[PDB]
Short mmCIF file of C-alpha atoms and ligand atoms in Angstrom, two decimals:
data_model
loop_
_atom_site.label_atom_id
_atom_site.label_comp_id
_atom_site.label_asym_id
_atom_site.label_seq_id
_atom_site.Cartn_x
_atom_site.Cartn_y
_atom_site.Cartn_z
CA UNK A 1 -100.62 -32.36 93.87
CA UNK A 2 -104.40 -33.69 93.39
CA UNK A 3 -105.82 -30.28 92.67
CA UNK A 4 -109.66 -30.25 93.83
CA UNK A 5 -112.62 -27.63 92.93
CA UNK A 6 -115.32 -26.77 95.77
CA UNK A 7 -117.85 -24.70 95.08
CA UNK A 8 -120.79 -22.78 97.68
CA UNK A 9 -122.24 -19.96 98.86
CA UNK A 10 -119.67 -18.76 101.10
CA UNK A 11 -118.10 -15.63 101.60
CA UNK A 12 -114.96 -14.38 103.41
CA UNK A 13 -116.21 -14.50 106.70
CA UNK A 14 -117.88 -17.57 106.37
CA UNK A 15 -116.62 -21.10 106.59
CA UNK A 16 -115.35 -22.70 103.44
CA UNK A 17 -112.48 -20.03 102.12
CA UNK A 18 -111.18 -20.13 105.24
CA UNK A 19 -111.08 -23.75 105.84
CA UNK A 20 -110.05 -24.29 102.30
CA UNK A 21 -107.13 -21.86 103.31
CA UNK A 22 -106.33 -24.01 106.60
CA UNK A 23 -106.78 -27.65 104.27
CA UNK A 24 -103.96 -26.23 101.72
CA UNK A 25 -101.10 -24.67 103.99
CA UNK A 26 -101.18 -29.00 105.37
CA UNK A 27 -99.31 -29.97 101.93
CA UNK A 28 -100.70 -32.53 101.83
CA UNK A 29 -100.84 -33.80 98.70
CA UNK A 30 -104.07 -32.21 97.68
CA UNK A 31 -104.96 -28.77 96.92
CA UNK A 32 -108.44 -27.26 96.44
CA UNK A 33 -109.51 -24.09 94.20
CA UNK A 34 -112.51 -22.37 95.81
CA UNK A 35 -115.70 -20.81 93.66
CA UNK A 36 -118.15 -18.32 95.46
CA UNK A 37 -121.65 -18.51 94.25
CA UNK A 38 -124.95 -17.07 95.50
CA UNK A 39 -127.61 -18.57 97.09
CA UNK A 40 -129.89 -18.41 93.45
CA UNK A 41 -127.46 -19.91 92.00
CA UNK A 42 -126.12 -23.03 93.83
CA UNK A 43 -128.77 -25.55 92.63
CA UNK A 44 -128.89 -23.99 88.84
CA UNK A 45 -125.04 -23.61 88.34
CA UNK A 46 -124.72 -27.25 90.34
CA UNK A 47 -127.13 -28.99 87.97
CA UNK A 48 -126.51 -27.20 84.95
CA UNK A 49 -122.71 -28.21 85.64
CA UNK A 50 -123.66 -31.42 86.43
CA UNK A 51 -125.54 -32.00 83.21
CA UNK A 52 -122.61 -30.40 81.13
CA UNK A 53 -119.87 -32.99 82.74
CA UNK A 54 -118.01 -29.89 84.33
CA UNK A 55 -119.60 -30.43 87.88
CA UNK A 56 -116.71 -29.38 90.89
CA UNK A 57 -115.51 -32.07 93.30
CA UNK A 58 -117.44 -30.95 96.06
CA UNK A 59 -120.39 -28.70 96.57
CA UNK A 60 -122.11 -27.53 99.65
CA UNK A 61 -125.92 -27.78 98.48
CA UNK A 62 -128.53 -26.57 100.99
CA UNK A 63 -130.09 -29.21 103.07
CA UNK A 64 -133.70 -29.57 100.95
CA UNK A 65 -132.03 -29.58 97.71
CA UNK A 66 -130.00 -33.17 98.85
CA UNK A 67 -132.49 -35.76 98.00
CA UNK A 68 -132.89 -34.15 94.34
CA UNK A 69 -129.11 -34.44 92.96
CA UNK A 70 -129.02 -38.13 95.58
CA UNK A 71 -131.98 -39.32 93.60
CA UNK A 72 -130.55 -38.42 90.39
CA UNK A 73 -127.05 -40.06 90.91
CA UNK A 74 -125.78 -36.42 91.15
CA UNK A 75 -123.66 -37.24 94.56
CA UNK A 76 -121.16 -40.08 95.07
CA UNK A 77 -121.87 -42.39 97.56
CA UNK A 78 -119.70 -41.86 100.52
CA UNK A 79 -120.87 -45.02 102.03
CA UNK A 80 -118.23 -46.90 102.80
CA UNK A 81 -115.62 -44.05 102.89
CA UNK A 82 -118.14 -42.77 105.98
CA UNK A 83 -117.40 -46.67 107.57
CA UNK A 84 -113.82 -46.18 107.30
CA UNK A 85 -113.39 -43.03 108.71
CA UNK A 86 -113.03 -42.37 112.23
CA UNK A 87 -113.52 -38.59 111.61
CA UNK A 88 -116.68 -38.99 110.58
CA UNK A 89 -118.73 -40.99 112.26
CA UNK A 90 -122.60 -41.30 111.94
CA UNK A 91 -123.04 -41.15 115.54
CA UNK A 92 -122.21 -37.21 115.62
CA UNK A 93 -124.99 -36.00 113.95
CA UNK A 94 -128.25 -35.06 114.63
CA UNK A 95 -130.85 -37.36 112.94
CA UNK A 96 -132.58 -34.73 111.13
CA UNK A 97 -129.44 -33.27 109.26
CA UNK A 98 -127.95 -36.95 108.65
CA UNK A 99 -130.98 -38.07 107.18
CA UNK A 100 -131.25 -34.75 104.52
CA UNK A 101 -127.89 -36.84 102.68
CA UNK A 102 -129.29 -39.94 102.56
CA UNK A 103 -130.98 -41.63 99.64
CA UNK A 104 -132.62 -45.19 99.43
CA UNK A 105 -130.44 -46.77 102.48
CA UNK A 106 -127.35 -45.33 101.52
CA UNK A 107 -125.30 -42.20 102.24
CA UNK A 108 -124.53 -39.19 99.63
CA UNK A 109 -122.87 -36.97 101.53
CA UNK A 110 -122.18 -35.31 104.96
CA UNK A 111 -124.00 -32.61 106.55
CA UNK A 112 -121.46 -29.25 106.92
CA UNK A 113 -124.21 -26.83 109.69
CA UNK A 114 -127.21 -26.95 110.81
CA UNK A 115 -129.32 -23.82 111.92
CA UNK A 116 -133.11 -21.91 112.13
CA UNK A 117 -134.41 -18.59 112.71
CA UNK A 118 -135.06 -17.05 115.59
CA UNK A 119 -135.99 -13.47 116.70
CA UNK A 120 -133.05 -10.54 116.99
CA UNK A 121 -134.64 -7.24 118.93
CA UNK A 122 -132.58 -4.00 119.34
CA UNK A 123 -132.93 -3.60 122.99
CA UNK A 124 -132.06 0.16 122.79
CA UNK A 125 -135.08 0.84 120.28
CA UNK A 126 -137.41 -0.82 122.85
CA UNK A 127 -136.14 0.54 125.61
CA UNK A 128 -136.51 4.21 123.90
CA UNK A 129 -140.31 3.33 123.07
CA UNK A 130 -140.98 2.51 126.77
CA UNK A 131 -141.39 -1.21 125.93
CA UNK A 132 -139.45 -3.57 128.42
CA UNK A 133 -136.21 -4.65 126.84
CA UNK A 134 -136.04 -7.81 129.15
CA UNK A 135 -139.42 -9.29 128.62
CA UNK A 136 -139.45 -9.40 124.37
CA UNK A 137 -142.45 -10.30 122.07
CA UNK A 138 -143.70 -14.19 123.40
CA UNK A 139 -146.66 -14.14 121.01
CA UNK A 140 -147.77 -12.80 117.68
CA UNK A 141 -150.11 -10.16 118.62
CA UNK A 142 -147.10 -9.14 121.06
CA UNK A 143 -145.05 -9.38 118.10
CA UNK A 144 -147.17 -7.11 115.95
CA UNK A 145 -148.08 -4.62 118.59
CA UNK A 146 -144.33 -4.21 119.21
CA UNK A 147 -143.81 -3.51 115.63
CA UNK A 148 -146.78 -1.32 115.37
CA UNK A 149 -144.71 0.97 118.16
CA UNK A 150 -141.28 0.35 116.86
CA UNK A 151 -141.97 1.88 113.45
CA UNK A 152 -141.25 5.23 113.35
CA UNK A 153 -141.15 6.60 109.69
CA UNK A 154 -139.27 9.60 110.89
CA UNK A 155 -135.88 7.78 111.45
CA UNK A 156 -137.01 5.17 108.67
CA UNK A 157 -137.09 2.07 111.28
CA UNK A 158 -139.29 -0.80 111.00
CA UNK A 159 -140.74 -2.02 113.66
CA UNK A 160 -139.55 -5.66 111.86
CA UNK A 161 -137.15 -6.88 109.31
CA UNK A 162 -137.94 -10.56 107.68
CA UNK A 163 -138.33 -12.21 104.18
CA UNK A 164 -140.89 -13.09 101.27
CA UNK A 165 -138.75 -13.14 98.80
CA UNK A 166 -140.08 -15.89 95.87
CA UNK A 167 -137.19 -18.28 95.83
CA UNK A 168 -136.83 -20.47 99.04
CA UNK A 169 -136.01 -17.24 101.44
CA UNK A 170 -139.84 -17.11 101.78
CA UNK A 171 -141.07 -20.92 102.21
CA UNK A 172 -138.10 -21.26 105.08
CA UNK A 173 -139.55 -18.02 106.86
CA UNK A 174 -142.72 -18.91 106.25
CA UNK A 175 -142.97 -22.22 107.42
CA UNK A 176 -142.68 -21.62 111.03
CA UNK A 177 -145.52 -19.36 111.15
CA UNK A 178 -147.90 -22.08 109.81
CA UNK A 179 -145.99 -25.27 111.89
CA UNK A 180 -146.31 -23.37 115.10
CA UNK A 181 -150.66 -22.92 113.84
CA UNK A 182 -150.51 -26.84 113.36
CA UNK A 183 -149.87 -26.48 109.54
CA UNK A 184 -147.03 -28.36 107.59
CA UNK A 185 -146.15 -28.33 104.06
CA UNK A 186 -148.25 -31.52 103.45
CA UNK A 187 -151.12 -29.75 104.85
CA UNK A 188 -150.25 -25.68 104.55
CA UNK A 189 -153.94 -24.18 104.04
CA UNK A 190 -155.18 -24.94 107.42
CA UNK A 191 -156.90 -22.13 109.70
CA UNK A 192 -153.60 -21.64 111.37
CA UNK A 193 -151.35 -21.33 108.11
CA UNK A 194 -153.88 -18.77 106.88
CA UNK A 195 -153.59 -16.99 110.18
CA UNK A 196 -150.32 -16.85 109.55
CA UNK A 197 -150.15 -15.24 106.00
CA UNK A 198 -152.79 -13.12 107.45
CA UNK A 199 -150.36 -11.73 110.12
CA UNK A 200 -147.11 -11.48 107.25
CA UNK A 201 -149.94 -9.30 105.06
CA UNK A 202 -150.41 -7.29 108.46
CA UNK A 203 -146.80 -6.52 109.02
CA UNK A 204 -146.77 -5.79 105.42
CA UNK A 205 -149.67 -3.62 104.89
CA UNK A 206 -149.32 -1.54 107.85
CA UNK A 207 -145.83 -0.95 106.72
CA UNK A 208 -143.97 -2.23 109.58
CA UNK A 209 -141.62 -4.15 107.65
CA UNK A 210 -140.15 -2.76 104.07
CA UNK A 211 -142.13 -3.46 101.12
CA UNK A 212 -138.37 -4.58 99.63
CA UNK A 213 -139.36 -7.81 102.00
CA UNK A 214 -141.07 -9.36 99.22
CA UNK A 215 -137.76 -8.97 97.12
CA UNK A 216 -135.00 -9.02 99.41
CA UNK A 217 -132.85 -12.44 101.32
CA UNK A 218 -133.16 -12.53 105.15
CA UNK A 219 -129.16 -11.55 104.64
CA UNK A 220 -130.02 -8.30 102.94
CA UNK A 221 -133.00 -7.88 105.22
CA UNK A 222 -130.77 -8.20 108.37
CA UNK A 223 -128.55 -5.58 107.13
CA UNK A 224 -130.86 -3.08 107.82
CA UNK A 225 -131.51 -4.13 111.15
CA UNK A 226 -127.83 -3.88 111.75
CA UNK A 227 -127.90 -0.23 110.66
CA UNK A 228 -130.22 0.88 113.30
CA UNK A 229 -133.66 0.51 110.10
CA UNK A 230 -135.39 -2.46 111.74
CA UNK A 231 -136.10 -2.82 115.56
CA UNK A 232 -136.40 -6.49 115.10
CA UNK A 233 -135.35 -8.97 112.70
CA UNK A 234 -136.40 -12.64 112.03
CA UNK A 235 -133.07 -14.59 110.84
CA UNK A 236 -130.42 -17.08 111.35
CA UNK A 237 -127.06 -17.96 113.23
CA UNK A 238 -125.41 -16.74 110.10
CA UNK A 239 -126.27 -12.96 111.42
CA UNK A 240 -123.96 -13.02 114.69
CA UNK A 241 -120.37 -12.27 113.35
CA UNK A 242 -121.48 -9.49 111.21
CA UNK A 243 -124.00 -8.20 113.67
CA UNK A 244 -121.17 -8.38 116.18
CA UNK A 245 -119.08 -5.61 113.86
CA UNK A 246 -121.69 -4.12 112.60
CA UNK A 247 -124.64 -3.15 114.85
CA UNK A 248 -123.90 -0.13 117.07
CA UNK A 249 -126.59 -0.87 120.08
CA UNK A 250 -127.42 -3.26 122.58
CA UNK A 251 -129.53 -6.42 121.18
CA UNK A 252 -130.60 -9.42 122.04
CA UNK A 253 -132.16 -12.53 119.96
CA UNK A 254 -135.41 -14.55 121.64
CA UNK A 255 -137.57 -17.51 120.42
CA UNK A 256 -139.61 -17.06 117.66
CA UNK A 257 -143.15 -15.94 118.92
CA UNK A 258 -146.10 -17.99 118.88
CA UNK A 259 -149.81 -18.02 118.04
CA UNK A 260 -150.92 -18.70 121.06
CA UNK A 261 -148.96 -19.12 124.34
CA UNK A 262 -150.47 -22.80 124.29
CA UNK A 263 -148.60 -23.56 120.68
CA UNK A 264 -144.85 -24.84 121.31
CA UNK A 265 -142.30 -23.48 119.04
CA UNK A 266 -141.68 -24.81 115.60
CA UNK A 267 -139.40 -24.37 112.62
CA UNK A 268 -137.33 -25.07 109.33
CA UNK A 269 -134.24 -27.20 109.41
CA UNK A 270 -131.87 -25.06 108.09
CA UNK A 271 -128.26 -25.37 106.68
CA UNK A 272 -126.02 -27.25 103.86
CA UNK A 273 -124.25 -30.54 103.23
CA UNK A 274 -121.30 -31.38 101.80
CA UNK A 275 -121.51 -33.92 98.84
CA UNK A 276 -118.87 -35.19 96.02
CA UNK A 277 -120.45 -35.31 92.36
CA UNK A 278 -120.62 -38.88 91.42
CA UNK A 279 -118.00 -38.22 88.56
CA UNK A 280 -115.00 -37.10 90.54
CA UNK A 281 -111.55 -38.49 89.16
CA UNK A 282 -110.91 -37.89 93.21
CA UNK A 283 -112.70 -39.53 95.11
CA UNK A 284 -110.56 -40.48 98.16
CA UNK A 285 -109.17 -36.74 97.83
CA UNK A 286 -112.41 -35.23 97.95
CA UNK A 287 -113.42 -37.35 100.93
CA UNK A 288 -110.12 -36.62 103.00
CA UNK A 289 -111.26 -32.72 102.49
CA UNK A 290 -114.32 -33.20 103.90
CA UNK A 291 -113.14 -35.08 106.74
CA UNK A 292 -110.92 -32.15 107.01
CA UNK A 293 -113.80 -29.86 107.23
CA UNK A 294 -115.65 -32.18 110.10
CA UNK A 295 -112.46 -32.35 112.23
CA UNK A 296 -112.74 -28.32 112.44
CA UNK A 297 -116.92 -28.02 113.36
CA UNK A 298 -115.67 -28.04 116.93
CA UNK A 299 -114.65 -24.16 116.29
CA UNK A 300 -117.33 -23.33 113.80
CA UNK A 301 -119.35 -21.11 116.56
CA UNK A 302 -116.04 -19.32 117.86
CA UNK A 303 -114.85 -18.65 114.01
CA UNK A 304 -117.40 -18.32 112.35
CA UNK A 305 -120.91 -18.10 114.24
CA UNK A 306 -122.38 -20.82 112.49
CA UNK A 307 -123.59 -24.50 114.26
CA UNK A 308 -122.58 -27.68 114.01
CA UNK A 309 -125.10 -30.40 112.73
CA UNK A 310 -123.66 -32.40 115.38
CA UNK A 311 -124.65 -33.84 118.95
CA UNK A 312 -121.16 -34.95 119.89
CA UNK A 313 -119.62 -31.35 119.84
CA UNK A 314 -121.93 -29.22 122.34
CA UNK A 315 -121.15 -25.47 121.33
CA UNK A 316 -119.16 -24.19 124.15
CA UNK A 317 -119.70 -20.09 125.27
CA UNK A 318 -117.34 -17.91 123.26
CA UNK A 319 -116.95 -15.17 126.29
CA UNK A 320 -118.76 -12.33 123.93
CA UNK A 321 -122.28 -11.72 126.24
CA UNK A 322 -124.19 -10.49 122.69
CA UNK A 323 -122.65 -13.81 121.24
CA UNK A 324 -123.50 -15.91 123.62
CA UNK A 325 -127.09 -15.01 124.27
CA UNK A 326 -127.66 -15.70 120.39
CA UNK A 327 -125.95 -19.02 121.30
CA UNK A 328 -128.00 -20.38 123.79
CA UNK A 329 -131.49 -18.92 122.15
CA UNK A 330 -130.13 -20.51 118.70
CA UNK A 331 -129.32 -23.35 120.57
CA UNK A 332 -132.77 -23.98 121.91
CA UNK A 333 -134.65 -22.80 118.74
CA UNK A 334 -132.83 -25.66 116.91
CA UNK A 335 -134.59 -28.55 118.47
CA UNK A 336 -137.88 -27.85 117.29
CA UNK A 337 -136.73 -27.23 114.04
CA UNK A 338 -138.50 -29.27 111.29
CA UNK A 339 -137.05 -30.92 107.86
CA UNK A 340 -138.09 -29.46 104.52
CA UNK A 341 -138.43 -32.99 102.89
CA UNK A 342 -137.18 -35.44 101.77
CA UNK A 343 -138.16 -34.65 98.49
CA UNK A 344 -136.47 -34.63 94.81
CA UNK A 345 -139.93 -32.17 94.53
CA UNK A 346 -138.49 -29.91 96.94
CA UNK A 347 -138.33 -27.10 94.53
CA UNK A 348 -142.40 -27.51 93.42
CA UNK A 349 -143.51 -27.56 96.65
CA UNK A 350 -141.51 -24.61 97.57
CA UNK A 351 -142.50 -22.47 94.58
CA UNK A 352 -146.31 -23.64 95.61
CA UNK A 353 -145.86 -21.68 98.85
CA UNK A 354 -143.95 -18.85 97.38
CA UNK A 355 -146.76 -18.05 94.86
CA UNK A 356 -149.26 -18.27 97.85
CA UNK A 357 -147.19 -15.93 99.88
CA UNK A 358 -146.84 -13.32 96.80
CA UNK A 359 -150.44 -13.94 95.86
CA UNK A 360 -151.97 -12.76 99.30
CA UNK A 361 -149.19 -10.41 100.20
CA UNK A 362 -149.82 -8.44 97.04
CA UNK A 363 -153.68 -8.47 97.93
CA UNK A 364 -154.29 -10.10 94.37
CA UNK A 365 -155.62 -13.53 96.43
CA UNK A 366 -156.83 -14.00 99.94
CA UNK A 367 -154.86 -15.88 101.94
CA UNK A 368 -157.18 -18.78 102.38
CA UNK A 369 -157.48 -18.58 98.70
CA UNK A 370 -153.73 -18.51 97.80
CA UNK A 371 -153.07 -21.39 100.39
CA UNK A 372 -155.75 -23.37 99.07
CA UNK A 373 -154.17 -23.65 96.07
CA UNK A 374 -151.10 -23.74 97.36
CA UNK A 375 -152.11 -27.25 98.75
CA UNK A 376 -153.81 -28.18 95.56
CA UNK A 377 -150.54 -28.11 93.87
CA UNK A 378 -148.45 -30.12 97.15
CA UNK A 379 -150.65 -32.97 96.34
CA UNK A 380 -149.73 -33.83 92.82
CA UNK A 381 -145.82 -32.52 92.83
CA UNK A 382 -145.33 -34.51 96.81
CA UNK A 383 -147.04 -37.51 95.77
O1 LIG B 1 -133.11 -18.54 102.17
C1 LIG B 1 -133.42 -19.79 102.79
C2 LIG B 1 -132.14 -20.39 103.32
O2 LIG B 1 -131.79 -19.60 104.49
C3 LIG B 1 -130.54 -19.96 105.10
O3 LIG B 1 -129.48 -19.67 104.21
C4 LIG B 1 -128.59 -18.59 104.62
C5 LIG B 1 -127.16 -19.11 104.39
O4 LIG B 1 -126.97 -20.28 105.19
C6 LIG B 1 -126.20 -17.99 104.72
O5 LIG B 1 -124.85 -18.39 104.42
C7 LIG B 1 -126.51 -16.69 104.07
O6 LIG B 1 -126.22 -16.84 102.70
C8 LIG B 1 -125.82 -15.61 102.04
C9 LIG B 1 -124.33 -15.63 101.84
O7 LIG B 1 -123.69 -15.87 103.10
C10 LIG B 1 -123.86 -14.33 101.23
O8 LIG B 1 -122.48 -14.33 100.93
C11 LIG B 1 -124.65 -14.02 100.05
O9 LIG B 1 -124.26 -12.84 99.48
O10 LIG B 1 -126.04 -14.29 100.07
C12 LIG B 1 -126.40 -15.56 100.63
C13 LIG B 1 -127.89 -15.61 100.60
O11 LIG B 1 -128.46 -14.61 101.40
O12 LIG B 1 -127.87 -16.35 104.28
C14 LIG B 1 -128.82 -17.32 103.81
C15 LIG B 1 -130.19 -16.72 104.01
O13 LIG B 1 -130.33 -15.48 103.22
C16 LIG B 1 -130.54 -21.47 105.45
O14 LIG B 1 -129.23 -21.85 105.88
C17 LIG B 1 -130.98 -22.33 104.26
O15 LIG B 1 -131.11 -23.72 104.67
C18 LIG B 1 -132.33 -21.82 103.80
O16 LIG B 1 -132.85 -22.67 102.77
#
């Protein structure tokens, strides 16, 4: 056998164990050994790797993070292995994900989900504080006032569960905020954006969301909405299959409010790609695995809860009501959805906004203040 490594983020009840699982039992010839990093640690390990000459076969790398290792001749270039194949075919994908691989005309790699955030509310919770369970938050001062009356220190619930953590957790939370107030990372210290970090340091201050949200992933945040600690949470597709086991009430998952109701909804493309580093002794291999992985998206939803970056393959209903609802809103959500990049800066543009977001959230900067230099700093690293 043609023994292959893959490495990504992850975990048992998540995609690429089990698919790696499904690829070996084919005989095919090929075999792949599986390593489970964490989110932190997928660009360092990748690149550090990389640098050493002990880089895996394939990685799955997080959709902003592409252009980076493409610029760098990091990734193969699956060009003409993509023209070959059947299996994969250009055509499939949505533009926004299929343009996160590509690099100066060519293509170096192939995107593995697509996703955003949208709004989870435990419909119990509401219902017990007299608010109307059918008719969630469509606004942010909705969204606030809802928290305000969802937080009840005496049962330790939040009215809200999100993320500020200072890594990219924060930038991809907070750039909806400031896109739906006509902000955009080229441009983040507008009115709106500012209105924005004013309303995080409002959910913040008034402790209706933990103060472990400055520390804490939207996975680990979600958990303790799940546990009955957080009437609402802002996160992902990712959420459903654990929510499914884990959360003991009646919820249901809306758009993401807006500023006003005359602002359209607006996010951050999320998700990863697969790519090959440009030094495999396996190229073909490598490739065949990854067509592998395509040929299953169309049960990525019913397995796993996670979307396809993919136009072809409309996600059909699963049959679960809780599951399907999240569908259809995730579903929606997705088409406003916004790309972080390109950029090979990606990481200095994010750690601009993070530092704004800490820097007002902590009350050490205003926001207008924190943003301002926020945008100072977007100049010179996106130019
Ligand atoms: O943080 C910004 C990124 O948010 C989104 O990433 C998701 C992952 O897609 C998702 O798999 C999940 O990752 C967690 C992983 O499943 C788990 O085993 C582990 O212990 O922690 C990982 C990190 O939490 O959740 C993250 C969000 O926390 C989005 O897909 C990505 O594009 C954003 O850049």
């Amino acid at each position: 056998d043609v023994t292959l490594t893959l490495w990504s983020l992850d975990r048992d009840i998540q995609p690429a164990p089990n698919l790696i699982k499904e690829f070996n039992a084919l005989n095919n010839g090929i075999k792949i050994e599986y390593r489970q990093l964490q989110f932190d640690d997928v660009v360092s390990e990748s690149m550090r790797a990389y640098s050493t000459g002990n880089a895996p076969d394939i990685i799955a790398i997080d959709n902003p993070n592409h252009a980076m290792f493409a610029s760098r001749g990091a990734f193969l270039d699956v060009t003409d292995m993509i023209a070959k194949s059947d299996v994969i075919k250009t055509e499939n994908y949505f533009p926004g994900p299929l343009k996160s691989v590509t690099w100066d005309g060519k293509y170096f790699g192939v995107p593995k989900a697509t996703n955003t955030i949208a709004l989870y509310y435990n419909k119990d919770l509401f219902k017990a504080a007299g608010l109307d369970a059918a008719k969630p938050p469509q606004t942010w001062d909705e969204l606030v006032d809802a928290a305000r009356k969802l937080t009840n220190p005496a049962k330790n619930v939040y009215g809200i569960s999100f993320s500020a953590k200072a890594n990219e957790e924060g930038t991809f939370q907070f750039l909806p905020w400031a896109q739906m107030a006509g902000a955009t990372y080229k441009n983040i210290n507008t009115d709106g954006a500012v209105k924005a970090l004013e309303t995080w340091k409002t959910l913040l201050d008034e402790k209706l969301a933990s103060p472990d949200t400055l520390t804490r992933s939207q996975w680990d945040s979600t958990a303790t909405f799940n546990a009955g600690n957080a009437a609402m949470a802002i996160s992902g597709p990712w959420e459903i299959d654990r929510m499914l086991k884990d959360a003991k009430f009646d919820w249901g998952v809306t758009l993401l409010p807006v500023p006003t109701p005359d602002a359209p909804r607006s996010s951050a493309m999320g998700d990863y790609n697969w790519a090959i580093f440009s030094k495999t002794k396996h190229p073909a291999e490598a490739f065949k695995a990854i067509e592998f992985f395509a040929s299953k998206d169309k049960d990525m939803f019913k397995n796993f809860g996670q979307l396809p970056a993919r136009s072809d393959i409309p996600v059909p209903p699963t049959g679960n009501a809780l599951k399907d609802e999240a569908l259809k809103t995730f579903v929606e959500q997705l088409k406003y959805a916004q790309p972080r990049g390109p950029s090979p800066e990606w990481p200095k543009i994010s750690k601009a906004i993070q530092d704004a977001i800490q820097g007002a959230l902590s009350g050490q900067m205003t926001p207008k203040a924190a943003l301002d230099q926020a945008a100072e700093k977007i100049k010179l690293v996106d130019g």
